[PDB]
Write a protein that binds this DNA or RNA. Structure first.
Ligand SMILES: Cc1cn([C@H]2C[C@H](O)[C@@H](COP(=O)(O)NP(=O)(O)OP(=O)(O)O)O2)c(=O)[nH]c1=O
Ligand SMILES: [Mg+2]
Ligand SMILES: [Mg+2]
Ligand code: NA
Ligand code: NA
Length: 326
DNA sequence: CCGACTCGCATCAGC
DNA sequence: GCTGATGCGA
DNA sequence: GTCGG
């Protein structure tokens, strides 16, 4: 990271606009600029140099020049001193508490960690578990642990039905040396885009993982998406592993490649690829890639037989998962 | 100059 | 209960 | 906040 200081500054500004200003497009603007600078293979010398990159306009160019000259940003220094901003930015770090709820909690005088802990009855379920594992959820997961978790999930899933296929995506599939959480794609031949020949396909998997005490908590749970908490087993006299966030996503089996492309990421890579898809006259979700008729409505799903096919349509060279970490 | 920047689950308002 | 919007998150 | 039209 040749420009770590610059990208940190931009990320912190992105978090401000998202959590405090509640301006999601400014959040995305700052995160795009941070991303494009992160992969820039030179140590940036000026805001003008950075301005040539796509996503870096005039305003960010000015802030880069201020940072390079002084090592600080006065706009950020003020934001850090603001109490409401500081309180909201902290509260939103609890999973389940977004910008809206964070601002509402502050109005009611709930703005610290002990505040949250004494007002548990004013949290919904997701928020209560997010508070419960606040410390754990901010810890990274070494790939070594990710490999153990993959081993458990894939085997427990096989025990339920051998026709399941569990694929670990996210930063792990991109080959990250450490991950923020675990992301699992799930397929079963009974569930396709044409029909669902078996009920509770995701349920049975979740229940099995609970049965062996891998899954410990549930944030949300529906037909196709599970969002919860898991933990590795520790041997005798060991300090326990931290509790980890786990997402499980059931996708129609015939729509695997669109699914695995989506969940592999990164999130900014997905935004860029889908934006590029639009400019090429296609639209992409986790299910399909569809053309746009000039009238502006999506047409019928095009044939997809690999991840590369999706790249081919929008005229991108194929990029390995390890080169999608934007 | 300025419109525009994919979806699942929880929860709530309105009927 | 159903529908559609909002919040939050992947 | 940025940018393509
Ligand atoms: C947050 C987010 C995620 N995704 C997709 C891309 C991610 O790689 C995938 C899993 O989300 P994640 O676990 O929050 N991101 P990650 O696995 O790439 O990185 P890490 O968990 O922080 O290590 O979901 C989106 O398509 N839009 C999003 O806004
Ligand atoms: Mg992840
Ligand atoms: Mg995740
Ligand atoms: Na630029
Ligand atoms: Na949060």
């Amino acid at each position: 990271t040749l420009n770590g200081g610059i990208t940190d500054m931009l990320t912190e500004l992105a978090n401000f606009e998202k959590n405090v200003s509640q301006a999601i497009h400014k959040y995305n603007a700052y995160r795009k600029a941070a991303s494009v600078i992160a992969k820039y293979p030179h140590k940036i010398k000026s805001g003008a140099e950075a301005k040539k990159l796509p996503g870096v306009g005039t305003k960010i160019a000015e802030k880069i020049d201020e940072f390079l000259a002084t090592g600080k940003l006065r706009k950020l220094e003020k934001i850090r001193q603001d109490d409401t901003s500081s309180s909201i930015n902290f509260l939103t770090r609890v999973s389940g508490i977004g910008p809206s709820a964070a601002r509402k909690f502050v109005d009611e005088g709930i703005k610290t960690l002990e505040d949250l802990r004494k007002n548990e009855d004013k949290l919904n379920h997701h928020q209560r578990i997010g508070l419960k594992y606040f410390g754990d959820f901010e810890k990274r997961i070494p790939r070594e642990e990710m490999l153990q978790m993959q081993d458990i999930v894939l085997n427990e899933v096989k025990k339920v039905d051998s026709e399941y296929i569990a694929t670990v995506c996210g930063s792990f599939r991109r080959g990250a040396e450490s991950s923020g959480d675990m992301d699992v794609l799930l397929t079963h031949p009974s569930f396709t885009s044409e029909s669902t020949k078996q009920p509770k396909l995701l349920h049975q998997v979740v229940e099995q993982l609970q049965k062996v005490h891998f899954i410990t908590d549930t944030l949300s749970k529906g037909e196709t998406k599970f969002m919860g908490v898991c933990q590795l087993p520790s041997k005798n006299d060991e300090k326990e592993y931290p509790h980890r966030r786990i997402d499980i996503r059931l996708i129609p089996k015939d729509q695997y490649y669109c699914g695995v492309l989506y969940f592999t990421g990164s999130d900014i890579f997905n935004k860029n690829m889908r934006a590029h898809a639009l400019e090429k006259g296609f639209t992409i979700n986790e299910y399909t890639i569809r053309p746009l008729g000039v009238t502006g409505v999506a047409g019928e799903p095009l044939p997809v037989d690999s991840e590369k096919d999706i790249f081919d349509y929008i005229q991108w060279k194929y990029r390995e998962p390890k080169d999608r970490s934007e």
